[PDB]
């Protein structure tokens, strides 16, 4: 479950028994507006819009209202920020988490490609710490994907921002005197000019100390929920949901089928193509290629580590079954899309993987097996003459152990999402 430092955190905002409340010892009151969306699959995931009633207000207990020259403190949360697509967002800093009142306190704000921490004393001495990310990038680790934010403040030296458990930047704050923050914390888009802007946020916490790097890394690992497979955006991977595939070893290709049946094969076709709005973004197109759909071989539709599965593939508006004849000498087993009623004694059961038995994570998601739990190999690809055919290979399985590096079997499942819109190609 949650770490001890979470259980003893001074504000621990979580969904419990049908409501969002504070789990901390302080049990601060939470007021939720009428246009807040809670993800039905994972109600800890909170969506806040550019609308007046889309807000959450925390009424802090007096004991933890920040008023000090010396008390260290930190905040952590995950956020998912939709791609910026309007030029109106270019030079528009908007607050999202506000504890700044009467010229002192702290706030989290966003801007085009930015997450910003602002801290200010009662003399209005101010410091800012920023995380920048680009929208001019082939495949982004940050745009529209869940990222873990941690901000720590040591009153004697620095404020630091971490992203995904890793230090990004730090700025001195030792010149700041008494900081007297707000009695409340307002989660709300404030001053955003993009009327369609929203954020997703989850797992907000406040701590009354400077978290160290080990604690932050541990929080990151714990809150990642690694026993559950994730889609590209970082949401839970689901059964019966169409995903566009992205191979991390060769991102500039998409999955296609030359012909259906055992005489045909699955391969990576290129180029993937780009999407662009001048001065705003330039990225690889994500919504390309033949969709995979994950099929049950628990009633909640969430795909978990070690779940046995079938993979369906959508070709020309019809579903087929990923399968292969593994009885031949070659270690690489070429994958084909079969008519589902015609799969027969072909190998088709896949074990979904997020991590190994020792807890080590790996992006290699699909280990094809026979029907008795015996490995055929992780699904990746292999060049045959000029053609990068989809392949299952035990060579991958041997590589997973020795090294943590990206391999041909490393995949991402990308569902269509409101935070990433593409014009049609």
């Amino acid at each position: 479950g949650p770490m001890n430092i979470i259980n003893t955190s001074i504000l621990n905002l979580r969904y419990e028994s049908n409501h969002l409340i504070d789990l901390s010892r302080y049990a601060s009151k939470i007021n939720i507006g009428s246009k807040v969306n809670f993800d039905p699959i994972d109600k800890n995931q909170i969506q806040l819009f550019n609308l007046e009633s889309s807000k959450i207000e925390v009424i802090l207990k007096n004991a933890i209202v920040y008023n000090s020259m010396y008390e260290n403190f930190s905040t952590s949360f995950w956020i998912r920020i939709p791609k910026y697509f309007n030029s109106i967002s270019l030079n528009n800093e908007y607050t999202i988490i506000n504890c700044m009142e009467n010229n002192s306190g702290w706030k989290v704000s966003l801007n085009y490609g930015e997450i910003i921490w602002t801290l200010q004393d009662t003399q209005e001495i101010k410091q800012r710490v920023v995380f920048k990310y680009s929208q001019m990038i082939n495949i982004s680790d940050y745009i529209n994907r869940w990222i873990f934010v941690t901000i720590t403040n040591n009153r004697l030296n620095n404020s630091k921002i971490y992203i995904n458990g890793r230090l990004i930047d730090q700025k001195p704050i030792s010149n700041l005197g008494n900081i007297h923050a707000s009695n409340n914390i307002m989660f709300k888009l404030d001053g955003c000019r993009d009327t369609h802007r929203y954020i997703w946020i989850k797992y907000f916490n406040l701590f009354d100390k400077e978290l160290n790097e080990k604690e932050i890394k541990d929080l990151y690992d714990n809150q990642s929920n690694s026993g559950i497979l994730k889609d590209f955006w970082g949401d839970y991977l689901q059964y019966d949901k169409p995903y566009y595939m992205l191979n991390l070893y060769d991102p500039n290709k998409y999955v296609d089928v030359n012909n259906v049946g055992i005489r045909g094969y699955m391969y990576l076709k290129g180029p993937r193509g780009s999407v662009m709005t001048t001065n705003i973004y330039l990225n690889s197109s994500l919504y390309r290629g033949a969709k995979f759909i994950i099929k049950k071989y628990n009633k909640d539709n969430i795909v978990r580590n070690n779940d046995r599965v079938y993979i369906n593939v959508v070709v020309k508006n019809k579903e087929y079954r990923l399968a292969t004849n593994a009885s031949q000498a070659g270690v690489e087993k070429i994958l084909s899309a079969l008519e589902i009623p015609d799969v027969g004694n072909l190998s088709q059961v896949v074990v979904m993987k997020s991590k190994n038995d020792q807890g080590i994570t790996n992006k290699c998601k699909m280990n094809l097996q026979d029907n008795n739990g015996n490995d055929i190999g992780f699904i990746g690809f292999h060049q045959f003459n000029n053609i990068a055919k989809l392949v299952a290979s035990n060579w991958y399985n041997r590589q997973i152990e020795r090294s943590s590096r990206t391999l041909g079997c490393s995949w991402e499942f990308i569902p269509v999402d409101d935070g990433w819109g593409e014009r049609p190609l």
Partner: nanobody
Amino acid sequence: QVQLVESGGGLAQPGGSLRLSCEASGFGTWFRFDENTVNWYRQPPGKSREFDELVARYPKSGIVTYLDSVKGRFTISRDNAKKMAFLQMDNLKPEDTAVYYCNVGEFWGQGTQVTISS
């Protein structure tokens, strides 16, 4: 063999109204209409699609957002059983002239011209 087909655009006078409609057909059972967001975009006259504006969005959550200039004038809606989406456009202005597009999930209509004559 799947398509979004749009209708209901064309010419109108300032202060007048139109209603755009959009229908999703041919989609296999893998496609769940209810799970998809319906959007209406418009392309400003004289500009490329890079200048497309999001006019209105209706996601599965039901929390609708509008372009600022159309707030109070345009209303978006959807019919999940009919697989349809609608854009009710009232009190039109010359600056509403544009090619309008229906977008459902990753799928797009071809575009429908709306022209407001001063």
